[PDB]
């Protein structure tokens, strides 16, 4: 797996992808690791363009995600800012 970068401009409705994983909801086989299920068309992600669905994160802005809950994955997208630089996994 290779871990990527993609720099998302928070917009007026946040930053436009949905994730699934984290420390509490196990999105994988029973795993922490959070990791994308679906961006949303509209969005500052599918504005851009520069991530994909099932990404793995790993770090949001300047958090590490490899031991927090799915809630705080998701709440680090939208703590990341503006335009936040997400770090992801990609089998």
Do not use: C, W
Request: no cysteine; proline share 3%; aromatic share 6%.
């Amino acid at each position: 797996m290779e871990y990527e970068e993609i720099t998302l401009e928070r917009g007026n409705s946040g930053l436009g992808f949905s994730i699934a994983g984290g420390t509490d909801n196990p999105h994988i086989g029973d795993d922490p690791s959070i990791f994308i299920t679906k961006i949303i068309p509209g969005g500052a992600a599918a504005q851009d363009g520069r991530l994909r669905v099932n990404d793995s994160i790993l770090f949001v802005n300047e958090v590490d995600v490899r031991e927090v809950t799915h809630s705080a994955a998701v709440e680090a997208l939208k703590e990341a800012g503006s335009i936040v630089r997400l770090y992801v996994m990609r089998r």
